[PDB]
Write a protein that binds this ligand. Structure first.
Ligand SMILES: COC(=O)c1cc(C)cc(O)c1C(=O)c1c(O)cccc1O
Lengths: 140, 140
């Protein structure tokens, strides 16, 4: 894997792209083959490709305003090219305040300048429930 | 400063082995006497467990799940920070049907590096929080 300081720079940019709460900014640090997989595996939530995320995050980020990201724990394994972030998110929607918490497992690419794989344990009800309901709305 | 990386890694290995062994004394041998456990997410408000609390828990729990298996999916070790994360999948048989769980478990080592000092654990907490205390009503 890449040197620790190269990986660490990517890890920091990943976090600031998330905190920036824009689709292009967040995806800037994905590799081209990067995927996101919701945990636990038992929930059977389909993998998200980079393209899936480009289509999904504009509406999702528009729904949640005043987004703030609290980084509670960062664990960086430079010899393995891996990291974990525990993050707490807060936002507003018309349905009131919004909160989530994420245990996000990251793999860096070999060059070390991108995130190549994400596995994420979080409250997935929005992508599990509310999103089959948009598929049918644009279907209608 | 943190313990030697090599010792932390060995403690991580032993912690996993004590978990897999599915006995109270075997698993808690790798917890410091002051070790605490915190169920994640924080929004669930589950009170911190002391080591003593956990010593009362694990006996009847481990007694109720048979053929316990522990599969280690991901280990992320930050030796400079004296921390690690494990992603693990567990299964067991119970008289009510099969048990499955998955755990994103954040660990901190003690100064010598031969014990885990602090645990924060994202997992399905329903059995511990809902099923086990229905047996607290039984005792009384
Ligand atoms: C627009 O979403 C993101 O930027 C996002 C970002 C990261 C690092 C993890 C996520 O899980 C999400 C997300 O998908 C999401 C969601 O699906 C529902 C609510 C809040 C969220 O942050």
């Amino acid at each position: 894997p890449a040197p620790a300081e190269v990986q660490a720079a990517t890890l920091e940019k990943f976090i600031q792209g998330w905190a920036g709460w824009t689709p292009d900014g967040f995806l800037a640090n994905w590799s081209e083959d990067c995927t996101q997989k919701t945990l636990p595996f038992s929930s059977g939530v389909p993998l998200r490709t980079r393209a899936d995320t480009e289509k999904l995050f504009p509406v999702l980020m528009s729904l949640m305003s005043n987004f703030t990201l609290d980084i509670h724990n960062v664990v960086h394994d430079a010899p393995q090219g891996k990291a974990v972030i525990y993050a707490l998110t807060k936002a507003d929607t018309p349905f009131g305040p919004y909160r989530n918490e994420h245990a996000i497992f990251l793999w860096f690419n070999e060059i070390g300048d991108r995130v190549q794989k994400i596995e994420e344990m979080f409250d997935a009800v929005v992508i599990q429930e509310f999103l089959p309901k948009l598929d049918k709305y644009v279907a209608d």
